Nucleic acid binder design. Structure first.
Lengths: 1341, 316, 50, 251
DNA sequence: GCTGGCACGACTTTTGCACTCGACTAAAGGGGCGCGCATGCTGTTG
DNA sequence: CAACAGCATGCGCGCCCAGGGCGTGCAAAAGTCGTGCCAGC
């Protein structure tokens, strides 16, 4: 495929057998597409700002006849760039402006409108935009906003699993969940009665909520039950037959159907006697009277003459009633069915418990029920009733709620209003009773069908709607008798609630957090994370153990391996590779479509509900050129299960094997051989690695590294490419091809790389150019590498020659011994940049000034400062050297001889000023890499504040001058081209610049055309470019927006290189971790017969118990990987011909079964091959994808080509004794990391420090110098030893005994070592705090 | 409560705390520790001042305990961490700070003892006649004086005042057309409305006093009490609590409610050329003010120019 | 504020042997009380007892 | 609870006292006014609510505030908390002359010993050092001593050795489950930032070397030192005082 | 005889002092669990 | 129709962080600017 360019600098070798279909996606995409849909104009109105405008507008005021409306929004352009904005510490956002039409109408005049007026735009707030990479810069910090996965709106059902009543039942409760509004949850009693809860309220009867619907009891029972019939005329007593309505009963008498007995008394009820009466046509028949005594009347029945009193409803009929209804002359009687097998007599007992079935009594009952105390006002009832659900905006379940509400009840229409209705709640009660009847099951809450993701679009839209309603309840007051000032869309709108709400969200919020900036892969995995926590739900500690577990629908949606191992476990998950999300917020995952038994290359994204209906094959399975499965029985998934099916049954297939695994784990070689928990650690550990000075490409890897690097957006990637004009460390320009260009802009593309820059985790970000010079580049090729990147691959650690074997106990337990070589060669050396800021501000006593000079301070200390008082760039600073000095004046020192004497002798030395300065924190170190110094407008800063002014100005002028040199070169080419036609002076034209003063008039055509175009374009480009330089110049000389109580601002950056020591906390991809126990000299290590010592020695005994065998296979293939590079090393070092080198690399790439990577040489020729070979001199980078990876067999094969022993073990020699170890040993390259845990950050130690005002105990932690909690278990252990003195000095003397700490330390200094214990403060306190209740507690002698 | 970082405290150390810590650790007797504790409280955040000695002696209530006992102990206390501590008068401060020069300092020991012990009162102005007193000449004396001027004063190294006590402003005065326009930057609701009315009174003050003019135009609280009809004490309380913020000369505005301030500005102008005469002439300036129409007659308006740490009187 | 939470008088002084009202400032007296206020000197650890 | 810019803000417990005082003064004012029983009645109600809210913010519902709310805390909550003055005074003092670092292996270094990082002692032993310095006569005054150990040159490391000699230290780890979980050792100074722990005791501590961290504490006095030698040194207890069978067993 | 500091006066600034209840319309949360003790309604013993 | 015993529902313990977050007059008394007087150089 000829690849592209940088890829041809090093090609990894692919061992993956299965071909790929769907390319891995954008990864980040889930952030962008969210917020890209939140900022859009939409005609339909939903999806982003439009929806919050339409959520309110238009506003009606109060019977005003005048209103207000709005039209779109639009935007502004952001004032600062992302880098500027990040430096200055300003939040990165943009103006939101909206045109609101105002309509003013006359009173008492219907439909008449007197006038209308609208402001061009009103400016409301600034919405923060999003960078290209997925972060919102906010007060010069990145901050990723985390996606959340919440219980979806719609109708839900629950069995309770009968774990309450201790008898056991099935208690079926249904909750309705809106997008915003109240909750309705119907439940069952132990006695089997439905109850209504509203917002977790004590249970109410069932038929009151239904009684609010203007339904009479007749309509209640007739609507919620069967009709059937019963008829008795002159004691004929013929009832309608319902054989299909009953599956059983006990017959008390012989049932005769049309002069023939169908079923005798006690005869079989089985389907024989049923179909026997079915096939035969039978009308209404007579039954025994005693059977009716159990039936209950339905409709209200009254005599024709008198309609008084008895038998309204829900009354078991009596023998007294038969005479009355029979004498009344009613032929037909409609009664309830109620035969209990599936069916049940519910909702009738609810009527029994219901105190009154009247509407008004129910509304008053609920109205008085909501708030505990309430008067029966009757208005609360009408208000809350319509309000709590049927208001336009009060309760809204929205589109997910409505859709899933439709599919939950099996409605055909998927569209509807966002508010409930009578038939809605009635149908919910119908389905609820239906679940009790045995027909229908429950829903799994864990199912991903029932769990939806919200991303930053949807959440920002929420808070923006909130913020907008809080404005509208105010703006409603302008037309409220606020009368008329006209000019409405200017003073009426207050932007403060909108802005404070939006920047309140992004600022502070559980789901906006500081981004993990160590690693690219940390960045990535932060920005695709799905949290269950937050605003929308899962308070944790109370969540329970079931949302922790992997459910079978997480199949290629979340990940089963990447999860925090800490006490939020299964809570915070990570998107799987190829996962995406719907318009409805549900996780869907791709599959190849299989028609007949051939696999079509069309892919379909299936949602978790859609997925279970079908059959889906296995990621890794066989296949043919034709596309038929090799094996006739293929392992597949159906529904919650897996098993073998026939060839013709399965319609889908998994695309790639990467589907189950997340990107984090998609990086780990040999992940099969690893146990899942141990895999689970190592996935987490590659995040907390730390990029080192030189980035080594991993020598064995999955193939995934190109994506992550270039997606993470830490690399500099070339747009619209072409040949490289200019190169350098900080800057890289590309002269683009003539093909891709916008006409009239012309020009080239420039890239300014970012040099050393703190990250949120105080680590370096550094870009270093990959490309050379005079080299062609296409779009997508990487120009620079960010930190922990090599030529577009993700390189988080280093490769190390590992030997497995115990070595003198130094590698014991999980520790780890390393050759001094490693420390000399500086792999694992990592930079750290730390920020410190000084700010100079106005006090009550007057302004504060920075430096030159200070009271009571030596010249010694001041030697590293400048004329202006900031430290010279370049200084080495340690300990409490003064980084910026500053003076704070005190009050009014006047007179008396001593004051006048000190002022006379020393010149007062600026007198009242104090020593307040920016001294370095004690125990910190490092050179000063950069100083910023933001100032105030009109302070007249002068001094050295201007050096950054001139510096940035020269950089800007130099960057703009390039386009003027190239465009002026083009104009000079046109002028030089036109002068050739006539009046050509040749060299004389070149030696005479500035048009040769137009070179007279030449021809009239060249006069007017050449002088007009040349002079016009020349003066327009000169004046326009100078105008850009004047605008930028005005942007440079100014001062920032700033607090009223701050005058000028200075910040200093420091850098330290930190060198590995025996506190390293090194790890590997395979869940391997340790410390560095010791650094050995080089001669003390084990070495092979050629004298090459292993770098780093690790303890075999790790490996069986933990069952992570990725480690071992990694080593072996690593071994074999170096081997090839050793062949080539040795080959190029002997000055071999290009042809033979080509032959051995070609012969290397093509080894293995299958392996799908067809690269071959002869396509690229002469150099290009020498290039790569020199690029792979240090090892050949073999790449084994996740579950299609390299087999042992292929590893031994690869390894025999390197003249290495097939077993991967080798004889090694002791380094001290020179003696061979008995037994061979595995040696191999394994690829290590250094984790962000360093002991420099850990070792604390205090003796005596500052205490706490109350309780008078030492302070909490390091940095503040904690002392070290000695907690209750630790006391228990001493008591258990019976050592009561040690315990007694802990409790007292060395924590809260104040007099006794002093006496203690004074005796120690004197050599007494005696205690003199007293009474600890904190007891005294307690006695006061109990005296603060009316209890005395006193100590009695 | 606990388990959180409640603002329980820091327990920092001042100078007296630290001195007392230093006394705890030194071989004082039972009595001498009482004299030491008696002196360290007498010490000030400024160092040097140990206030009156004979009140230190008399504060103990006789019963023996002479002056010499407090004197010796006093010296030893004067010797603790910040070098010269306490003592009195700055003279003995510089003699204790000069007590340790290592004695290997060339020319400095002797000369420094003569200059610092005695005659240092005349070293204020310059050398001059003192050069004839000690017979020294050229840079021999100037280098010793370089050392004396290199000493610093007392303590104020312990300090423990990291708190700058910032202003935080309250209401911002965005400068308009050579003046100022309010914007207010940065029951309980009734108190907030009262604060807004105080900002409105500050805006009225903008109308009450010219910004561009020297100092501020004279105004009475009866003007702000005339505008909103509020009581004087209430307005003065709002302006006393909150502090108005302006781009230039921002202040609580409590002093903003052209009077004496204009005279102070005139005094500052007189001070600029007042350098030529050390004695100064506020009384002559008062005569000039009377000629200008002020009618000042050696009044405190002139005296204020002659006060406020002016060269006037002090130079005389 | 006088007669309030936090107040001098009851609850003791603020600075060690220095008290509000600016009189009998230090160590002149083991106890004493001003004429302006009830300030009882003696140390200020008494904010932890009274 | 003093603020960032000055202008102290009221603590949590103060609000309860302010409230009670407001209702007490208002009930007193309306009580001395001789007014109807309804409004002073509602004032009696309001004040019992107020005092009952200052003693326990539970008892009934809501309590809290409009501050972001939360129950606030009361004088009851000032006690009986999972972490409180009672918990702080109960087995739980936070503590002095202590420090903490990462563990490495000890693979020479006999049982009763313990690799203690050079830099880290020198702190733990400060008082002790100054004593020695004043004895030898290298410092006449406390400030001198202080300054030489601040400058940390030369004699001081030499004296550190002399200080540490035979002075038992005690190490402690993490969940302390049984009494073995803290034990006492003779330190041996070692340049490094980490603590070397002999293998054999890794059992007891339940510690591997994957980034576990130990605290260290310094017994002072005499009694305490002897209780460390004759009770907590690792060479006293080799047998597990549960089952009785040896710990120390080689793994 | 002139300048500076302080004392006396006027002014104009500071300070007295508080009760009604004011309220005000929503603002949301929200997947543990055991365990026990007491109050209350039901039920059966005579 | 009486008191007595039992079943059940509700309420309060535990575990455990978790994070911060924070106007309306008039009137009596007093602070200060102005002016004059007295003392120092």
């Amino acid at each position: 495929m000829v690849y592209s360019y940088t890829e041809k600098k090093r090609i990894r070798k692919d061992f993956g057998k299965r071909p790929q279909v769907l390319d891995v996606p954008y990864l980040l995409s889930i952030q962008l597409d969210s917020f890209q849909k939140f900022i859009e104009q939409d005609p339909e109105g939903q999806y982003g700002l439009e929806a919050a405008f339409r959520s309110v507008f238009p506003i009606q005021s109060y019977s005003g006849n005048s209103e207000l409306q709005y039209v779109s929004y639009r935007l502004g352009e952001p004032v600062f760039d992302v880098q500027e904005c990040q430096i200055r510490g300003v939040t990165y956002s943009a103006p939101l402006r909206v045109k609101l039409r105002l309509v003013i109408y006359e009173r008492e005049a219907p439909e008449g409108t007197v006038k209308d007026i609208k402001e061009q735009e009103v400016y409301m707030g600034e919405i923060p935009l999003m960078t290209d990479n997925g972060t919102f810069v906010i007060n010069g910090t990145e901050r990723v906003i985390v996606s959340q996965l919440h219980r979806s709106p719609g109708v839900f059902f629950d069995s309770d699993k009968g774990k309450t009543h201790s008898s056991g039942k099935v208690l079926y409760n249904a909750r309705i969940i809106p997008y915003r509004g109240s909750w309705l949850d119907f439940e069952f009693d132990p006695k089997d009665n439905l109850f209504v809860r509203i917002d977790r309220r004590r249970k109410l009867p069932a038929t009151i909520i239904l009684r609010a619907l203007n339904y009479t009891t007749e309509q209640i029972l007739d609507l919620f039950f069967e009709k059937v019939i019963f008829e008795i005329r002159d004691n004929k007593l013929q009832m309608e037959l319902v054989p299909e309505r009953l599956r059983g009963e006990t017959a008390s008498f012989d049932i005769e159907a049309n002069g023939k007995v169908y079923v005798e008394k006690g005869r079989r009820i089985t389907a024989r006697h049923i179909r026997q009466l079915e096939k035969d046509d039978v009308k209404l028949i007579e039954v025994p009277v005693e059977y009716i005594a159990g039936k209950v009347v339905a409709k209200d029945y009254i005599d024709e003459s008198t309609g008084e009193l008895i038998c309204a409803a829900n009354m078991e009929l009596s023998l007294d009633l038969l005479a009355k209804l029979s004498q009344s002359g009613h032929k037909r009687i409609e009664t309830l069915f109620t035969n209990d097998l599936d069916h049940g007599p519910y909702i009738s007992e609810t009527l029994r418990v219901d105190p009154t079935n009247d509407r008004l009594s129910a509304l008053v009952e609920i109205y008085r029920m909501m708030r505990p105390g309430e008067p029966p006002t009757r208005e609360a009832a009408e208000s809350l009733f319509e309000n709590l659900f049927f208001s336009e905006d009060r309760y809204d379940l929205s589109a997910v709620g409505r859709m899933k509400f439709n599919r939950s009840l099996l409605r055909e229409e998927i569209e509807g209003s966002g508010i409930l209705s009578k038939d809605d709640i009635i149908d919910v009660m119908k389905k609820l009773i239906d679940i009790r009847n045995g027909k229908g099951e429950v829903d799994d809450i864990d199912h991903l069908g029932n769990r939806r993701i919200r991303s930053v679009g949807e959440m920002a839209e929420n808070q923006f709607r909130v913020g907008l309603v809080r404005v509208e309840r105010a703006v409603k007051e302008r037309l409220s008798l606020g009368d008329l000032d006209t000019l409405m869309p200017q003073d009426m709108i207050n932007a403060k609630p909108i802005s404070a709400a939006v920047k309140e969200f992004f600022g502070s919020s559980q789901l906006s957090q500081f981004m993990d900036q160590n690693n690219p892969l940390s960045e990535i995995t932060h920005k695709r994370r799905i949290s269950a926590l937050g605003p929308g739900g899962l308070t944790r500690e109370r969540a329970g153990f079931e949302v922790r577990d992997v459910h079978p629908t997480h199949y290629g949606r979340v990940c089963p391996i990447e999860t925090p191992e800490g006490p939020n476990i299964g809570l915070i998950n990570s998107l799987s590779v190829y996962a995406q999300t719907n318009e409805y917020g549900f996780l869907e995952t791709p599959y190849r479509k299989v028609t007949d038994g051939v696999v079509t290359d069309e892919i379909h994204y299936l949602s978790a509900i859609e997925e279970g209906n079908y059959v889906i094959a296995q990621a890794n399975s066989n296949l043919d050129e034709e596309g038929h499965f090799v094996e006739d029985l293929v392992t597949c998934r159906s529904k919650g299960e897996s098993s073998l099916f026939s060839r013709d049954q399965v319609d889908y297939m998994d695309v790639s094997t990467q589907q189950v695994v997340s990107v984090g784990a998609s990086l780990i070689p040999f992940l099969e051989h690893d146990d899942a928990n141990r895999a689970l650690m190592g996935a987490n550990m590659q995040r907390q690695a730390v990029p080192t000075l030189r980035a080594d490409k991993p020598l064995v890897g999955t193939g995934m590294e190109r994506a992550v690097a270039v997606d993470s957006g830490v690399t500099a990637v070339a747009k619209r490419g072409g040949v490289v004009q200019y190169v350098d460390a900080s800057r890289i320009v590309i002269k683009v091809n003539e093909d891709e260009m916008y006409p009239g802009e012309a020009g080239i593309d420039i890239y300014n790389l970012t040099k050393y820059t703190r990250s949120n985790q105080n680590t370096c970000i550094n870009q270093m150019p990959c490309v050379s010079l005079g080299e062609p580049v296409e779009r997508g090729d990487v120009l620079a590498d960010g930190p922990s990147t090599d030529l577009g691959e993700l390189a988080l650690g280093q490769n190390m020659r590992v030997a497995f074997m115990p070595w003198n106990g130094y590698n014991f337990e999980d520790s780890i011994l390393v050759s001094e070589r490693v420390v000399q060669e500086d792999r694992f050396t990592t930079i750290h940049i730390q920020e410190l800021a000084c700010v100079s501000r106005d006090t009550k006593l007057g302004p504060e000034e920075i430096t030159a000079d200070i009271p009571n301070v030596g010249e010694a200390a001041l030697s590293k400062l400048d004329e202006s008082g900031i430290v010279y760039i370049g200084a080495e600073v340690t300990g409490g050297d003064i980084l910026v000095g500053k003076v704070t004046p005190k009050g009014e020192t006047q007179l008396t001889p001593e004051e006048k004497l000190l002022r006379a002798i020393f010149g007062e030395k600026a007198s009242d000023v104090k020593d307040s300065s920016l001294r370095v924190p004690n125990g910190v170190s490092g050179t000063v890499i950069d100083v910023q110094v933001f100032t105030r407008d009109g302070v007249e800063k002068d001094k050295r504040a201007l050096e950054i002014e001139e510096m940035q100005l020269k950089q800007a002028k130099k960057d703009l001058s390039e386009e003027l040199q190239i465009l002026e070169a083009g104009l000079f080419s046109r002028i030089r081209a036109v002068l050739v036609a006539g009046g050509v002076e040749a060299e004389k034209l070149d030696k005479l610049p500035r048009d040769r003063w137009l070179e007279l008039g030449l021809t009239d055509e060249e006069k007017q055309n050449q002088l007009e175009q040349l002079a016009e374009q020349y003066d327009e480009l000169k004046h326009e470019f100078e105008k850009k330089l004047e605008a930028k110049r005005r942007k440079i000389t100014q001062g920032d927006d700033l607090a009223p109580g701050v005058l000028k601002i200075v910040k200093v950056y420091l850098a330290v290189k930190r060198r590995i020591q025996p506190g390293d906390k090194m790890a590997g991809r395979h869940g391997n971790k340790g410390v560095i126990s010791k650094i050995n000299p080089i001669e003390d290590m084990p070495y092979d017969e050629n004298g090459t010592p292993v770098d780093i020695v690790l303890n075999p005994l790790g490996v069986p118990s933990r069952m992570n065998i990725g480690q071992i296979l990694e080593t072996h293939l690593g071994m074999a990987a170096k081997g090839i590079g050793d062949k080539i090393n040795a080959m190029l070092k002997q000055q071999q011909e290009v042809a033979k080198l080509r032959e051995f690399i070609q012969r290397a790439y093509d080894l293995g079964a299958d392996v799908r990577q067809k690269v071959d040489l002869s396509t690229f020729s002469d150099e290009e091959v020498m290039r790569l070979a020199e690029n792979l001199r240090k090892g050949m980078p073999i790449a084994t994808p996740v579950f299609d990876g390299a087999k042992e067999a292929e590893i031994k094969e690869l390894l025999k080509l390197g003249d290495l022993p097939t077993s991967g073990q080798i004889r090694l020699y002791d380094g001290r004794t020179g003696e061979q170890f008995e037994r061979p040993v595995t040696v191999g390259y394994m690829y290590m990391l250094k984790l962000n845990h360093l002991v420099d950050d850990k070792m604390h130690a205090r003796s005596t420090g500052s205490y706490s005002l109350v309780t008078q105990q030492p302070l909490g932690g390091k940095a503040q110098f904690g002392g070290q909690r000695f907690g209750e278990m630790e006391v228990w252990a001493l008591e258990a030893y019976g050592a009561a003195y040690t315990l007694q000095e802990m409790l007292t003397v060395k924590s809260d005994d104040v007099n006794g700490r002093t006496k203690m330390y004074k005796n120690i200094v004197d050599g007494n070592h005696q205690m003199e214990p007293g009474m600890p403060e904190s007891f005294n306190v307690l006695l006061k705090e109990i005296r603060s209740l009316g209890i005395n507690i006193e100590l009695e002698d | 409560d606990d388990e959180l970082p409640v603002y329980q405290g820091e327990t920092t150390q001042t100078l007296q705390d630290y001195l007392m810590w230093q006394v705890e650790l030194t071989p004082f007797t039972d009595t001498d520790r009482a004299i030491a504790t008696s002196i360290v409280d007498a010490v000030d955040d400024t160092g040097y001042l140990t206030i009156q000695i004979e009140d230190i002696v008399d504060s103990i209530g006789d019963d023996e305990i002479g002056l010499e006992e407090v004197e010796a102990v006093l010296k030893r206390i004067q010797r603790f961490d910040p070098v010269g501590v306490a003592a009195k008068d700055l003279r003995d401060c510089l003699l204790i700070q000069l007590s340790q020069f290592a004695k290997e300092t060339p020319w400095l020991e002797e000369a420094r003892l003569i200059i610092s012990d005695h005659l240092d009162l005349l070293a204020n102005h310059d050398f001059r006649t003192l050069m004839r007193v000690t017979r020294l000449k050229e840079e021999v004396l100037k280098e010793a004086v370089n050392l004396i001027q290199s000493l610093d004063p007392r303590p104020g190294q312990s300090i423990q005042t990291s708190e700058p006590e910032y202003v935080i402003p309250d209401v911002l005065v965005r400068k308009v057309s050579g003046r100022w326009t309010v914007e207010l930057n940065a029951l309980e609701s009734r108190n907030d409305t009262l604060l807004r009315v105080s900002r409105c009174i500050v805006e009225q003050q903008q109308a009450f006093f010219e910004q561009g003019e020297e100092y501020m135009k004279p105004m009475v609280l009866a003007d702000i009490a005339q505008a909103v009809e509020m009581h004087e004490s209430t307005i003065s309380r709002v302006t006393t609590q909150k502090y108005l913020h302006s781009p230039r000369g921002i202040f609580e505005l409590k002093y903003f409610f052209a009077s004496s301030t204009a005279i102070r500005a005139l005094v500052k102008k007189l001070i600029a050329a007042e350098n030529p005469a050390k004695p100064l002439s506020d009384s002559k300036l008062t005569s000039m003010l009377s000629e200008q129409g002020i009618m000042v007659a050696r009044r405190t308006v002139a005296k204020y120019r002659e006060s406020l740490s002016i060269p006037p009187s002090n130079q005389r | 504020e006088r007669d309030g939470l936090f107040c001098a008088r009851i609850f003791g002084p603020v600075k060690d042997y220095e008290c509000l009202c600016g009189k009998y400032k230090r160590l002149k007296h083991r106890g004493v009380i001003c004429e302006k206020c009830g300030v009882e000197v003696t140390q200020t650890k008494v904010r932890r007892e009274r | 609870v003093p603020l960032d810019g000055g202008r102290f803000a009221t603590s949590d417990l103060n609000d309860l006292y302010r409230r009670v005082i407001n209702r007490n003064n208002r009930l007193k004012r309306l009580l001395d006014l001789a007014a109807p029983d309804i409004i002073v009645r509602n004032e009696k109600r309001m004040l019992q609510e107020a005092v009952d809210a200052l003693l326990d913010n539970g008892r009934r519902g809501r309590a809290i505030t409009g501050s972001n709310k939360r129950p606030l805390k009361s004088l009851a909550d000032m006690i009986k908390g999972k972490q409180g003055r009672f918990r702080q005074n109960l087995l739980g003092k936070r503590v002095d002359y202590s420090g903490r670092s990462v563990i490495t292996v000890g693979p020479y270094l006999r049982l009763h010993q313990c690799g203690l990082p050079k830099k880290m002692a020198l702190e733990l032993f400060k008082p002790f050092i100054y004593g020695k310095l004043e004895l030898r006569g290298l410092a006449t005054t406390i400030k001198a001593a202080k300054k030489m150990v601040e400058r940390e040159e030369a004699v001081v490391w030499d004296i550190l050795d002399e200080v540490i000699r035979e002075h038992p230290v005690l190490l402690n780890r993490a969940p302390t489950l049984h009494r073995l979980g803290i034990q006492a050792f003779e330190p041996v100074l070692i340049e490094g930032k980490a603590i070397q722990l002999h293998p054999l005791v890794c059992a007891a501590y339940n510690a591997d070397f994957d980034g576990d961290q130990m605290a260290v504490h310094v017994p002072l006095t005499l009694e305490a030192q002897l209780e460390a030698r004759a009770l907590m040194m690792s060479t006293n207890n080799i047998l597990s005082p549960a089952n009785g069978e040896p710990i120390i067993v080689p793994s």
